[PDB]
């Protein structure tokens, strides 16, 4: 399928044990896609002071359309030293590995895969 319905656990930034997916734009987009497919991806909601607590390159989920079965359509945009790789809508949050942190909520997304 071109799109996959996912429910992403929303994590508090101070709980996150693994604070990024890797060391290049291409690696983090790769790893984020694999974790999204394997159900091992968390979402951190971006506010003042969140991003400096996480590791670059960042992977964002961004709204790609203006929501089938409650799932907001999103795509992946990566960021390194203030340059973004991809073009999309508003940020729903930053993706991180999920290694068993307790979530505060779930964000239903339809991921363009």
Curated annotation (Swiss-Prot):
Superkingdom field: Viruses
Domain CoV Nsp1 globular: 2-113
Region (Disordered): 1-113
Subcellular localization(s) per the UniProt record: Host cytoplasm
Signal peptide (residue range): none
Reported function: Inhibits host translation by associating with the open head conformation of the 40S subunit. The C-terminus binds to and obstructs ribosomal mRNA entry tunnel. Thereby inhibits antiviral response triggered by innate immunity or interferons. The nsp1-40S ribosome complex further induces an endonucleolytic cleavage near the 5'UTR of host mRNAs, targeting them for degradation. This inhibits the integrated stress response (ISR) in the infected cell by preventing EIF2S1/eIF2-alpha phosphorylation upstream of stress granule formation and depletes host G3BP1.
Name this polypeptide is given: Host translation inhibitor nsp1
């Amino acid at each position: 399928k071109t799109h996959v319905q996912l429910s992403l656990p929303v994590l508090q930034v101070r709980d996150v044990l693994v604070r990024g997916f890797g060391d290049s734009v291409e690696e983090v987009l790769s790893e984020a896609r694999q974790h999204l497919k394997d159900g091992t991806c968390g979402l951190v909601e971006v506010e003042k002071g969140v991003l400096p607590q996480l590791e670059q390159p960042y992977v964002f989920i961004k709204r790609s359309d203006a929501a089938p079965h409650g799932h907001v359509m999103v795509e992946l945009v990566a960021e390194l030293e203030g340059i973004q790789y991809g073009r999309s809508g508003e940020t729903l949050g930053v993706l991180v590995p999920h290694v068993g942190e307790i979530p505060v909520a779930y964000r239903k997304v339809l991921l363009r895969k």
